Amino acid sequence: SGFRKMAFPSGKVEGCMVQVTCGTTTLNGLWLDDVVYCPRHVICTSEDMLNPNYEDLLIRKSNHNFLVQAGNVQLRVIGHSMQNCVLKLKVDTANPKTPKYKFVRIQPGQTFSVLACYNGSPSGVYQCAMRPNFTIKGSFLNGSCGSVGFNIDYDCVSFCYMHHMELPTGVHAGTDLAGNFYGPFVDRQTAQAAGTDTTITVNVLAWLYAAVINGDRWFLNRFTTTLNDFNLVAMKYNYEPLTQDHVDILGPLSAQTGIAVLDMCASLKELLQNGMNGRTILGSALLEDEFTPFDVVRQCSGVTFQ
Amino acid sequence: SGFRKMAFPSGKVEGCMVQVTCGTTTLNGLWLDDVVYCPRHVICTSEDMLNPNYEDLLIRKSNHNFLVQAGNVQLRVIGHSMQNCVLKLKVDTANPKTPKYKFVRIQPGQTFSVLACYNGSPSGVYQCAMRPNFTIKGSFLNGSCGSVGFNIDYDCVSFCYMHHMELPTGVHAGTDLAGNFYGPFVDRQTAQAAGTDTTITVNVLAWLYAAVINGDRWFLNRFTTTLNDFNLVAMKYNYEPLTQDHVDILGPLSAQTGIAVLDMCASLKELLQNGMNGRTILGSALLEDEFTPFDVVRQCSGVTFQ
Ligand SMILES: *[C@](O)(C(=O)NCC)[C@H](C[C@@H]1CCNC1=O)NC(=O)[C@@H]1[C@@H]2[C@H](CN1C(=O)[C@@H](NC(=O)NC(C)(C)C)C(C)(C)C)C2(C)C
Numbered sequence: 001s002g003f004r005k006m007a008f009p010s011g012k013v014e015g016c017m018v019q020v021t022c023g024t025t026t027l028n029g030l031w032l033d034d035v036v037y038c039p040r041h042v043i044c045t046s047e048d049m050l051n052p053n054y055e056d057l058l059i060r061k062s063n064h065n066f067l068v069q070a071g072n073v074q075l076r077v078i079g080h081s082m083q084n085c086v087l088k089l090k091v092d093t094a095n096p097k098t099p100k101y102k103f104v105r106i107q108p109g110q111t112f113s114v115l116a117c118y119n120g121s122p123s124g125v126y127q128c129a130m131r132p133n134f135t136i137k138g139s140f141l142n143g144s145c146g147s148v149g150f151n152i153d154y155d156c157v158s159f160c161y162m163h164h165m166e167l168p169t170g171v172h173a174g175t176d177l178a179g180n181f182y183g184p185f186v187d188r189q190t191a192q193a194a195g196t197d198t199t200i201t202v203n204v205l206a207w208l209y210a211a212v213i214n215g216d217r218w219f220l221n222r223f224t225t226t227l228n229d230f231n232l233v234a235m236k237y238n239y240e241p242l243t244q245d246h247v248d249i250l251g252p253l254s255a256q257t258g259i260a261v262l263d264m265c266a267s268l269k270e271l272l273q274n275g276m277n278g279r280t281i282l283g284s285a286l287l288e289d290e291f292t293p294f295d296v297v298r299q300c301s302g303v304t305f306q
Numbered sequence: 307s308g309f310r311k312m313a314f315p316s317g318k319v320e321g322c323m324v325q326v327t328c329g330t331t332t333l334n335g336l337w338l339d340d341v342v343y344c345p346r347h348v349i350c351t352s353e354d355m356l357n358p359n360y361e362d363l364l365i366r367k368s369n370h371n372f373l374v375q376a377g378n379v380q381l382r383v384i385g386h387s388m389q390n391c392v393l394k395l396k397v398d399t400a401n402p403k404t405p406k407y408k409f410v411r412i413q414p415g416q417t418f419s420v421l422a423c424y425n426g427s428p429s430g431v432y433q434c435a436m437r438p439n440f441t442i443k444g445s446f447l448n449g450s451c452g453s454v455g456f457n458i459d460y461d462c463v464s465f466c467y468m469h470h471m472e473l474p475t476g477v478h479a480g481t482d483l484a485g486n487f488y489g490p491f492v493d494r495q496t497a498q499a500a501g502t503d504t505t506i507t508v509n510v511l512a513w514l515y516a517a518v519i520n521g522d523r524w525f526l527n528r529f530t531t532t533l534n535d536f537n538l539v540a541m542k543y544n545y546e547p548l549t550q551d552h553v554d555i556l557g558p559l560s561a562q563t564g565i566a567v568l569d570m571c572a573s574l575k576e577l578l579q580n581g582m583n584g585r586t587i588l589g590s591a592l593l594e595d596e597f598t599p600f601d602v603v604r605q606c607s608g609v610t611f612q
């Protein structure tokens with residue numbers, strides 16, 4: 001037993017991290033087969049970032065302008081293209097450590113592991129969720145651009161995030177691995193603000209089920225609620241609406257614990273209305289919303305990866 | 307910016323995990339050079355665990371009784387010895403993925419990453435602290451024995467923990483990699499209880515400095531305190547005593563933020579006495595004590611590993 005914010009084992013991704021240097025800009029790239037993926041603002045300078053035209057900027061580049069370090073081994077670029085906000089550098093060497101992989105654009109509420117990197121070297125790994133407002137509450141310092149977020153599914157790495165930028169509120173914005181930003185953000189230094197965030201209701205419910213699986217039951221009650229009446233209370237506390245689809249996803253957890261989903265909604269309702277009154281759940285004095293129903297099942301049942 | 311429970315990148319350890327099977331018992335082992343380390347209760351049975359005599363038990367074993375799977379490759383055992391509560395299986399093949407490594411017995415309050423494993427396959431990675439009562443609040447299901455905890459220091463993996471058992475309170479106990487239990491625990495099914503835990507005071511202070519580095523300042527005050535007067539309040543809230551040595555360790559963080567250590571102690575005092583009053587620190591509504599001063603500096607300055 002026990003319940004922890006658990007990241008996926010990061011080794012499959014560690015073997016793909018490289019350093020990309022162009023001009024005065026150094027950041028991380030992702031080396032898969034013979035392509036290195038990295039944020040396109042690596043071709044910017046200290047005065048380009050205000051409103052750059054990356055198409056002009058890139059047409060003025062030569063392959064030899066791109067320094068890619070894979071450890072103590074320099075890779076030479078033999079081609080380059082831009083795809084949305086990512087730059088793709090074709091190198092003459094295929095990464096022998098390339099894992100089985102996919103690129104996936106995730107929905108808000110979904111979680112993933114972030115391998116924070118500086119200068120192509122991994123620094124740490126942690127679990128994130130894509131917030132409803134398409135930011136992530138990460139831990140990123142200058143130099144971390146190009147670090148990626150991912151999930152692992154049996155033997156397959158599903159890359160879903162590459163880091164680009166930090167918003168004035170201390171939260172983070174980035175793209176999928178095809179270079180499309182999550183949310184309304186753009187890779188230019190202009191006024192941008194996250195948008196009001198909300199709590200991921202289906203995830204909170206998943207985590208309450210995790211608590212029950214693990215022996216916290218103090219927050220349960222004998223009441224039930226309708227989805228409609230629950231959502232009326234959720235909206236008041238700035239929770240995302242719970243859909244019948246969410247209810248269906250919570251089926252397995254509801255079945256394993258014997259607590260009907262709408263019964264758990266009644267518990268969340270009372271927790272929202274009364275607070276926790278000095279009690280904790282799974283070591284938290286807040287309602288935790290960065291575990292998906294799948295995360296809970298994986299960790300409470302012990303799924304692995306080869 | 308941002309502050310997350312960050313684990314070390316796990317790849318160096320992933321390449322060392324193997325499955326050890328003896329009789330009806332399967333668990334994880336750690337393959338370094340030509341030795342596989344694993345908990346000695348792999349030689350027990352369903353009726354041995356009540357009060358086994360591992361010396362008799364092991365003298366009755368043959369090398370061929372030990373099935374070690376390294377992926378889809380069976381390793382044959384050519385020797386075995388017991389060292390305290392770990393079993394050491396000499397195999398005929400040195401692990402080519404053996405990282406640079408050390409075995410270290412850590413002090414309570416120190417943190418480490420746990421690579422949770424089942425059947426030799428990594429499941430996830432998370433950050434733990436060794437509690438003052440020598441338990442860890444982990445996430446461990448049946449089959450996770452032999453999973454290891456570690457730190458990484460530049461290129462070197464310092465192994466500090468191997469998992470053995472779960473206590474009735476849902477917390478976990480294990481050994482160093484030389485097989486010595488942390489705390490008073492023994493690997494036999496007899497009444498054992500953790501002992502009263504306490505909060506790791508120097509770590510809470512580190513985390514308050516992390517909050518200041520990251521822009522939370524609401525909990526600061528103009529007061530100061532003496533170490534003596536602070537410790538009088540700490541003892542009342544079941545906090546570990548703060549030593550002058552702890553104060554010295556907090557020097558770098560105090561210097562970077564400009565907040566004297568004892569000034570931060572005055573802040574913690576008021577937080578203990580008044581609570582947080584519905585406010586959060588670094589996304590927590592509890593005082594967090596599983597970040598060391600070193601953890602804070604590493605994450606707020608961006609140290610990597612090759
Ligand atoms: C990233 O480019 C990097 O690591 N590069 C190494 C040279 C860097 C990561 C940032 C730095 C601090 N925390 C992070 O996550 N990203 C950027 O520098 C990014 C690049 C410039 C400006 N960038 C920012 O993140 C800036 N933020 C904004 O300007 N945000 C708004 C106002 C536009 C919304 C800051 C101020 C943090 C440098 C571009 C967006 C192209």
Ligand SMILES: *[C@](O)(C(=O)NCC)[C@H](C[C@@H]1CCNC1=O)NC(=O)[C@@H]1[C@@H]2[C@H](CN1C(=O)[C@@H](NC(=O)NC(C)(C)C)C(C)(C)C)C2(C)C
Nearest residue numbers: 001347446447448449450451470471472493494495496498
């Ligand atoms: C571990 O042996 C394993 O994974 N083996 C695979 C077959 C297992 C891990 C445990 C299981 C649940 N959570 C965990 O961390 N450890 C043990 O089974 C361990 C072995 C037996 C009994 N063990 C326990 O952990 C038991 N706990 C106790 O008996 N604890 C007290 C009362 C002695 C303090 C439980 C009840 C959890 C099986 C021995 C200690 C040798």
